[PDB]
Design an enzyme around this catalytic site. Structure first.
Site, PDB file in Angstrom:
ATOM      1  N   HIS A 174       0.843  -1.219   0.000  1.00 34.61           N
ATOM      2  CA  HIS A 174       0.000   0.000   0.000  1.00 34.61           C
ATOM      3  C   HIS A 174       0.872   1.261   0.000  1.00 34.61           C
ATOM      4  O   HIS A 174       0.884   2.012   0.976  1.00 34.61           O
ATOM      5  CB  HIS A 174      -0.942  -0.020   1.173  1.00 34.61           C
ATOM      6  N   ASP A 179      -4.877   5.691  -0.660  1.00 31.91           N
ATOM      7  CA  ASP A 179      -4.301   4.842   0.370  1.00 31.91           C
ATOM      8  C   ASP A 179      -3.282   5.651   1.174  1.00 31.91           C
ATOM      9  O   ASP A 179      -2.408   5.085   1.812  1.00 31.91           O
ATOM     10  CB  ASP A 179      -3.669   3.547  -0.234  1.00 31.91           C
TER      11      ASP A 179
HETATM   12 NI    NI Z   1      -5.619   0.602  -2.574  1.00 35.35          NI
HETATM   13 NI    NI Z   2      -7.221   0.983   0.799  1.00 37.59          NI
END
Ligand code: NI
Ligand code: NI
Ligand code: 1XN
Length: 329
Positions: free
Chosen positions: A79, A118
């Site tokens: 991420h 994110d």
């Molecule tokens: Ni994502």
């Molecule tokens: Ni996410």
């Protein structure tokens, strides 16, 4: 809270030019940004300029925003900044192939939302934050990390010289921040199941109507899931390598849960790697394949995403049957 780029960082980006060969490639759904890391911020500027126009954003503020966004992704296995740019590229390809279905405000909002979706991810799931009463779970009772990613996006926009949206009408500023909020919150896969089911029903009954804001919101929500999962739509070796990074995160989380006296779910247990192929089969059958199937029904030009997802599903089935050939770590 929030980190800021260097003067040298944004001024360098301002100077970037996308190598000519890459222009043709970046339009394709299957494009993999992997081999071009120095170019990722430039790839994003290029996409915004092609989709939204070179005058959409003041270039200095856009390059400041981009480089500060990069700085606020953490060095986690999955991420991270690479994932952000990959998800924004998938959104660019969807928007190029469906351009006039979306307004200029939506296109700019969605490309930004994908880049930011994110932000400040720590490598832990909503499940972890909530099982262990992390303060974020107290602040944000559902969609915990996603509400945090939106808050980080707002924080970065509020940095001096970073507000790329300041030139919008007072009403349009409100509208775009709402587009971004709903788009980020939609990346919570918990919400995906309900959304896809609603959309499939709307589509199958013929009630789906893109002049209806609530329907538009749901379509945009499914586009967000499709872009968030698009590692499953790449060529097999790219999909497989990405899965290695996803699982590195999962296993680091499971390691933490063991110390707190909970055995983790098999998917997060590094001592249960033999279950990964069946785990992937389950994810493709329950999440990825339905997602791209519904998206292709609503937006026919997105069909190559579904074709590639099906091809990858076939590859995981080959792994399960013991038919895999050499793979490189
Ligand atoms: Ni994502
Ligand atoms: Ni996410
Ligand atoms: N590729 C892939 N497999 C699982 N289980 C995922 C969960 C979230 C995002 C991508 C995923």
């Amino acid at each position: 809270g929030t980190s800021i780029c260097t003067s040298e960082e944004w001024q360098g980006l301002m100077q970037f030019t996308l190598p000519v060969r890459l222009c043709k490639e970046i339009e394709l759904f299957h494009f993999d940004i992997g081999p071009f890391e120095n170019m990722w911020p430039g790839i994003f500027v290029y996409m915004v300029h092609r989709s939204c126009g070179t005058s959409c954003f003041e270039l200095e503020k856009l390059c400041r925003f981009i480089m500060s966004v990069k700085k606020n992704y953490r060095r986690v296995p999955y991420h991270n900044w690479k994932h952000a740019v990959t998800v924004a590229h998938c959104m660019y390809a969807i928007l190029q192939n469906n351009h006039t279905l979306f307004t200029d405000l939506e296109r700019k909002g969605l490309l930004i939302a994908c880049l930011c979706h994110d932000l400040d991810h720590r490598g832990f799931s909503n499940s972890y934050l909530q099982k262990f009463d992390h303060p974020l779970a107290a602040l944000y009772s559902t969609s915990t990390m996603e509400q945090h990613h939106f808050s980080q996006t707002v924080s970065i926009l509020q940095l001096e010289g970073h507000n790329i949206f300041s030139t919008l009408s007072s009403s349009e500023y409100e509208q775009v921040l709402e587009i971004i909020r709903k788009a980020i919150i939609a990346t919570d896969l918990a919400l995906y199941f309900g959304n896809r089911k609603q959309l499939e029903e709307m589509y199958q009954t013929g009630s789906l109507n893109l002049n209806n804001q609530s329907h538009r919101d749901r379509v945009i929500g499914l586009m967000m899931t499709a872009c968030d999962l698009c590692s499953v739509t790449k060529l097999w070796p790219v999909t497989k390598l990405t899965a290695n990074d996803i699982y590195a995160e999962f296993w680091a989380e499971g390691d933490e849960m063991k110390k707190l006296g909970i055995q983790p779910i098999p998917m997060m247990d590094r001592d249960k790697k033999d279950e990964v192929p069946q785990g992937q089969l389950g994810f493709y059958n329950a999440v990825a394949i339905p997602c791209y199937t519904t998206l292709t029904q609503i937006l026919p030009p997105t069909e190559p995403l579904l074709k590639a997802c099906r091809d990858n599903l076939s590859q995981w089935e080959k792994v399960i049957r013991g038919e895999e050939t050499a793979t490189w770590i």
